[PDB]
Design a protein around this ligand. Structure first.
Ligand SMILES: O=C1NC(=O)[C@@](c2ccccc2)([C@]2(c3ccccc3)NC(=O)NC2=O)N1
Ligand SMILES: [Ca+2]
Ligand SMILES: [Ca+2]
Ligand SMILES: [Ca+2]
Ligand SMILES: [Ca+2]
Ligand SMILES: [Cl-]
Ligand SMILES: [Cl-]
Ligand SMILES: [Cl-]
Ligand SMILES: [Zn+2]
Ligand SMILES: [Zn+2]
Ligand SMILES: [Zn+2]
Length: 158
């Protein structure tokens, strides 16, 4: 792909944004993984110790890779495709204001997109797809992947 060569994938939250209650961050990240397990045989486990496949990091500016962040706006997050070490990891720009609601940038929606990259998906050219390369705020209560996103991930895993 690269794709993960297993269906049991671990993640760990490296650090928490002070923008949100910790329980809200946990829920947003858990649900973002669940979106993808809903349409594939992938199974994600949150681990609290040891080395996870996907490390979730909040950082600002230059943060140890070739993808330095840019302050508020613009780059919200980036993620590496499947592989060892930094492979799979998902980084969120701390200069954004992360929220559960309509203010700032919505963490769950950003994480669904970032995790798609952590799984090996590229971008969609369809403006309505979750994997379109522009952030779009939508209602979480009615949230669904587009057919294009579903076809993409199932091609990789299903
Ligand atoms: O304009 C963008 N800013 C983003 O962070 C990004 C994005 C993030 C979450 C959801 C949709 C879009 C994007 C990005 C980041 C840096 C430069 C360009 C795009 N980060 C990413 O993982 N895919 C992207 O398209 N697109
Ligand atoms: Ca499943
Ligand atoms: Ca990793
Ligand atoms: Ca930014
Ligand atoms: Ca912040
Ligand atoms: Cl922390
Ligand atoms: Cl599952
Ligand atoms: Cl778990
Ligand atoms: Zn980048
Ligand atoms: Zn990074
Ligand atoms: Zn993207």
């Amino acid at each position: 792909g690269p794709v993960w060569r297993k269906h049991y994938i671990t993640y760990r939250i490296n650090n928490y944004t002070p923008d949100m209650n910790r329980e809200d961050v946990d829920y947003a990240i858990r649900k973002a993984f669940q979106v993808w397990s809903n349409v594939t045989p992938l199974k994600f486990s949150k681990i609290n110790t040891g080395m996870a496949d996907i490390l979730v990091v909040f950082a600002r500016g230059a943060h140890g890779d070739f993808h330095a962040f840019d302050g508020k706006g613009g780059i919200l997050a980036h993620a590496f495709g499947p592989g060892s070490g930094i492979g799979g990891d998902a980084h969120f720009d701390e200069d954004e204001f992360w929220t559960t609601h309509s203010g700032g940038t919505n963490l769950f929606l950003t994480a669904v997109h970032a995790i798609g990259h952590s799984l090996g998906l590229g971008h969609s050219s369809d403006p309505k797809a979750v994997m379109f390369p522009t952030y779009k705020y939508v209602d979480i209560n009615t949230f669904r992947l587009s057919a294009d996103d579903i076809r993409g991930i199932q091609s990789l895993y299903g």
